[PDB]
């Protein structure tokens, strides 16, 4: 209907936004693991939204109320559920990495962002970064990028949850009384 | 049997049990990965009754 | 008519219950194997003792 179409449009917009953000993450510097850039989750959301747009075109075109329609409506529902799960997982990963990165002091080196976490005793974890233009430039905008990306996947996951919830409420909330 | 509210309580109970079991399986996998587990012992640290190795 | 689990849904429910039971048994066997191999007991690991400090 109209509401599923709006939800699919929001899904595609947010998927393209998060994929663009992940591509920018990768392009800034290859200092970050594949987990920390959730662009894979963005691509998954993008294919989800592509299937959604095809669904909401074919439903408005022809073959509206047959059995196979429901047979892959269930596929749409489960696919949106996995999209929501992957979005929440990306949120969790980004939150953990931001929490690690937000409570440490860093210094610049000749070619890398070598620095350590605050330590009670002189041995602790050390992090170095590829091709750092300045340790006060990448670190200082990375947190802003992370926060924006967090908001992006939070909204995407909420939209996915609502999309999953709407069709189920359509099916299992109203029971017919008269005949 | 299982007509009404009994069904809607049994389903919730089964779902809760499944979630707990999944969490427990994750904890077990985490243990098996932190300790490099082998049938003889942790990684190369062989363990027997007499002592370590 | 009749209400509750009547046809194929009963078979699906029984299959899901059996599968969950199998998974729980497998997890229990894995944990018991860990306990046997590392000799975990009421007194500790029986070979080390991770103190709080």
């Amino acid at each position: 209907c109209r509401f599923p179409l709006l939800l699919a449009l929001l899904q595609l917009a947010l998927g393209i936004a998060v994929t663009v953000l992940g591509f920018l993450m990768a392009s800034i510097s290859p200092s970050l693991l594949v987990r920390d850039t959730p662009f894979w989750a963005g691509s998954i959301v993008c294919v989800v939204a592509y299937l959604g747009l095809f669904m909401l075109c074919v439903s408005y075109q022809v073959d509206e109320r047959t059995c196979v329609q429901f047979s892959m409506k269930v596929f749409y529902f489960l696919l949106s559920a996995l999209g929501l799960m992957v979005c929440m997982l990306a949120v969790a990963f980004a939150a953990h990495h931001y929490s690690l990165l937000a409570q440490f002091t860093c210094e610049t080196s000749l070619d890398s962002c070598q620095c350590k976490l605050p330590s009670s005793e002189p041995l602790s974890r050390a992090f170095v970064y590829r091709d750092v233009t300045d340790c006060t430039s990448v670190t200082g905008t990375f947190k802003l990028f992370l926060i924006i990306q967090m908001v992006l996947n939070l909204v995407c996951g909420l939209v996915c949850l609502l999309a999953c919830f709407v069709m189920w409420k359509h099916r299992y909330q109203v029971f017919y009384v008269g005949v | 049997g299982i007509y009404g509210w009994r069904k809607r309580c049994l389903y919730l109970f089964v779902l809760l049990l499944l979630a707990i079991l999944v969490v427990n399986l994750a904890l077990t996998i985490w243990i098996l990965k932190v300790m490099w587990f082998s049938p003889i012992g942790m990684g190369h640290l062989h363990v027997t009754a007499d002592g370590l190795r | 008519h009749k209400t509750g689990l009547r046809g194929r849904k009963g078979n699906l429910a029984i299959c899901v219950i059996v599968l969950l039971f199998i998974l729980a048994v497998i997890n229990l066997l894995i944990t018991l194997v860990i306990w046997a191999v590392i000799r975990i007991g009421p007194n500790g690991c029986d070979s080390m003792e991770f103190h709080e400090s």
Binding site: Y172, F175 | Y3, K7, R8, Y11, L12, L15 | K2, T3, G4, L5, R6, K9
Partner: peptide, 5 residues
């Protein structure tokens, strides 16, 4: 008797 949680 449509079954669900």
């Amino acid at each position: 008797a449509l079954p669900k949680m």
